[PDB]
Amino acid sequence: GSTYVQALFDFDPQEDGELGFRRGDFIHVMDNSDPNWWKGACHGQTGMFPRNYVTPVNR
């Protein structure tokens, strides 16, 4: 389907397994878990990332 976003800012991991990307990086929202936090995938690696650190592309 379509669950991508565009990294609003740079997110450096801060958890064991977390996600790590850089502004404009399209996160792949694989499973909206939490309101301000979600599960996704980008640099060939999945993990969690603040949902407010990204922005929808299909809108």
UniProtKB/Swiss-Prot annotation:
The modification Phosphothreonine is found at residue 55. It is found in: Nucleus; Cytoplasm; Endosome; Golgi apparatus. Disulfide bonds: none annotated. The modification Phosphotyrosine is found at residue 53. It comes from the Eukaryota. Phosphorylation of Tyr-53 in the C-terminal SH3 domain reduces its binding to SOS1. Changing residue 50 to L: Abolishes interaction with SHB. Residues 3-59 form the SH3 domain. Non-enzymatic adapter protein that plays a pivotal role in precisely regulated signaling cascades from cell surface receptors to cellular responses, including signaling transduction and gene expression. Thus, participates in many biological processes including regulation of innate and adaptive immunity, autophagy, DNA repair or necroptosis. Controls signaling complexes at the T-cell antigen receptor to facilitate the activation, differentiation, and function of T-cells. Belongs to the GRB2/sem-5/DRK family. The SH3 domains mediate interaction with RALGPS1 and SHB. Homodimer. Associates (via SH2 domain) with activated EGF and PDGF receptors (tyrosine phosphorylated). Interacts with PDGFRA (tyrosine phosphorylated); the interaction may be indirect. Also associates to other cellular Tyr-phosphorylated proteins such as SIT1, IRS1, IRS2, IRS4, SHC and LNK; probably via the concerted action of both its SH2 and SH3 domains. It also seems to interact with RAS in the signaling pathway leading to DNA synthesis. Interacts with SOS1. Forms a complex with MUC1 and SOS1, through interaction of the SH3 domains with SOS1 and the SH2 domain with phosphorylated MUC1. This is Growth factor receptor-bound protein 2. The gene is GRB2. The chain holds residues 159 to 215 of 217 of the full protein.
